[PDB]
């Protein structure tokens, strides 16, 4: 069944690509010209000569060929969908293809036959296989895809069944979608209104069966929203801690039995009943400020087990992009685990749960047991550079020089950058040396660090992550694996900033020196090549994950009155994945070498933002 489905899907994709090519457009234009010429020749009384008969016969042959091609494509699509349904009805080892089924169901919602077959045969498919793509299904309630009411009703029924089966992983997404304007209400096109109405219908349908759980979850969500909307601009000068005022419902919100903590991942099982999950017991009465213009809030929650868990509520910011980033991170980690080449290398991506709560607010899981790179390296008091190289230039001197040179030209900037790099040697290589005395553990941590750096750099280049200064990367004190925490701007946003980002990922001297004596050559290059090969093999899944846009655009886009910038970033990501760019073909090794050259080029580092700490 899997072989037949893969063959049918490949044939359908090939036919679709052929139809979308410029050759098909030229053939269609020629066919239209032939049709209009035949029409004019029939309207006017003209004798049938050799040319007229030839034109009519070639037109008939072209029409027959086009009709046969369309029928064959439709039959291939139907066969692929049917074989996917048959394989997933009683299959367990082939559960990774469900995305492809969605890629063949949501993109072809206009056909009634496939929707009917999905609602007839695929209605019995287990609901635990759609959890990774639950957000994608919940993002398709818009009416822009007019393919009849049958597709909408079957999608709504499937979503309701999935939510009933697994309320833990479903209610949060629906409530976040329905709370786009909750911030304005507590303190908008036709598509948004329709999506909100559908989300409200889903919420009421779920609450008809589980009223207490739904009401508790929505009360917790409202408490989080009102906490995020709280104005803390008067507490910007306090760092020890500020007591939350008693008027907030979060303080009085305690003793939750049917509510599971959102910031902690839940190991989903095949049973619809959960009785061994950590719930919410109490909330701390003090919160801390993490700094910044937006003033994010840090809270601590005590669960049923009594272990305190730290959460970061980020008001006045959209974490939907960060949610997509975390989802694609998990997808990449799963793909790396599935591949036997990368499974042996133990290539993994460190991920932390991010739960959107509204269009302009959300929460995320705080990373514990990690220390900032800049705090370890360029600390004013006990920095590594000062401790190891007192004679070298201090961080303050480098910052002063960078501030004084930003008003100069390219030549002066390059000269001062070279002079700074001359009198500033990497010191990061001693990190594991000062934390793992045992040579075996030291080398294991170093290898894990190198592999994590390679994988993270590759994924960041693919996703266009640009905000990669010292404060956005946290190094673990035990596993020594870098974790990306900010993710504030991505998708090639650094070029939009006044200082363009000339590098795809952070590959400064400190990182390279900490990778070992071999530098970029060796483990880093091979790991990058393996990750690039895996991404080239799973471009289909990557595009399926990233295509959540064009239906529910996030904030900061489509303002000031098929999304423009969403289509642009999808095209850019497709070009990066296929290695086409401006029509040029690049191998995985060549692409890796080009990325390394761009990252380690001092010319690109000179033009970077002085606060990015390129020399560090």
């Amino acid at each position: 069944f899997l072989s037949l489905a893969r063959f049918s899907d490949t044939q359908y994709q090939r036919i679709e690509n052929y139809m979308k090519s410029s050759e098909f457009e030229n053939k269609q234009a020629l066919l239209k010209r032939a049709k209009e010429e035949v029409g004019l020749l029939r309207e006017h009384k003209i004798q049938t000569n050799r040319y007229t008969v030839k034109v009519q016969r070639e037109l008939e042959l072209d029409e027959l060929a086009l009709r046969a091609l369309k029928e064959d494509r439709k039959r291939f699509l139907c066969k692929a969908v049917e074989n996917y349904i048959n394989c997933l009805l009683s299959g367990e080892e082939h559960d990774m293809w469900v995305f492809r089924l969605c890629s063949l169901w949501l993109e072809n919602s206009g056909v009634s036959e496939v929707n009917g077959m999905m609602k007839r045969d695929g209605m019995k498919i287990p609901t635990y296989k759609f959890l990774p793509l639950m957000y994608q299904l919940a993002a398709r309630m818009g009416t822009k895809m007019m393919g009849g009411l049958g597709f909408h009703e079957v999608l709504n029924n499937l979503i309701s069944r999935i939510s009933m089966d697994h309320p833990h992983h479903t209610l949060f997404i629906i409530l976040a979608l329905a709370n786009a304007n909750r911030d304005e209400f507590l303190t908008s096109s036709q598509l948004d209104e329709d999506r909100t109405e559908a989300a409200n219908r889903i919420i009421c349908t779920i609450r008809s069966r589980r009223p207490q759980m739904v009401r508790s979850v929505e009360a917790l969500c409202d408490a989080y929203i009102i906490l995020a909307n709280l104005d803390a601009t008067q507490w910007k000068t306090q760092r020890k801690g500020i007591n939350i005022p008693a008027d907030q419902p979060i303080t009085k919100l305690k003793n939750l039995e049917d509510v599971v903590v959102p910031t902690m991942e839940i190991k989903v099982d095949h049973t619809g009943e959960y009785g061994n999950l950590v719930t919410i017991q109490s909330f701390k009465a003090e919160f801390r400020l993490a700094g910044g213009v937006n003033l994010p809030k840090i809270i601590d929650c005590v669960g049923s087990d009594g272990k305190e868990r730290r959460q970061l509520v980020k008001g006045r910011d959209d974490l939907r992009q960060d949610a997509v980033m975390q989802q694609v991170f998990q997808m990449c980690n799963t793909l790396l685990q599935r591949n036997t080449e990368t499974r042996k290398r133990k290539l993994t991506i460190c991920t932390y749960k991010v739960v959107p709560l509204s269009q302009r607010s959300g929460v995320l899981e705080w990373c514990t047991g990690t220390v900032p790179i800049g705090e370890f390296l360029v600390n004013n008091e006990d920095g590594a550079h000062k401790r190891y190289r007192p004679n070298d230039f201090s961080a303050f001197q480098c910052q002063k020089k960078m501030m004084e040179v930003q008003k100069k030209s390219f030549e002066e900037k390059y000269e001062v950058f070279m002079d700074v790099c001359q009198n500033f040697q990497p010191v990061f290589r001693y990190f594991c040396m000062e934390k793992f005395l045992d040579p075996a553990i030291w080398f294991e941590k170093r290898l894990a660090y190198t592999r994590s750096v390679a994988t993270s750099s590759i994924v960041g280049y693919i996703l266009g992550l640009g905000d990669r200064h010292v404060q956005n990367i946290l190094i673990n004190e035990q596993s020594a694996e870098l974790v990306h925490i900010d993710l504030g701007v991505a998708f090639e946003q650094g070029k939009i900033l006044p200082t363009p980002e000339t590098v795809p990922f952070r590959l400064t001297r400190d990182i390279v020196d900490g990778m070992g004596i071999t530098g970029v050559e060796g483990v880093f290059r091979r790991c990058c090549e393996k990750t690039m090969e895996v991404m080239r093999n799973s471009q289909e899944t990557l595009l399926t994950i990233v295509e959540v846009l064009l239906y529910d655009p996030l904030f900061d886009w489509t303002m000031n009155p098929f999304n423009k910038v969403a289509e642009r970033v999808l095209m850019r990501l497709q070009e990066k994945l296929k290695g086409v760019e401006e029509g040029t073909v690049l191998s995985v090794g060549g692409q890796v070498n080009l990325l390394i050259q761009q990252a380690i080029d001092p010319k690109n580092l000179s033009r970077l933002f002085p606060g990015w700490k390129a020399w560090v």
Partner: peptide
């Protein structure tokens, strides 16, 4: 001074 390039 802020590390990230705000706006």
């Amino acid at each position: 001074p802020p590390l990230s390039q705000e706006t």
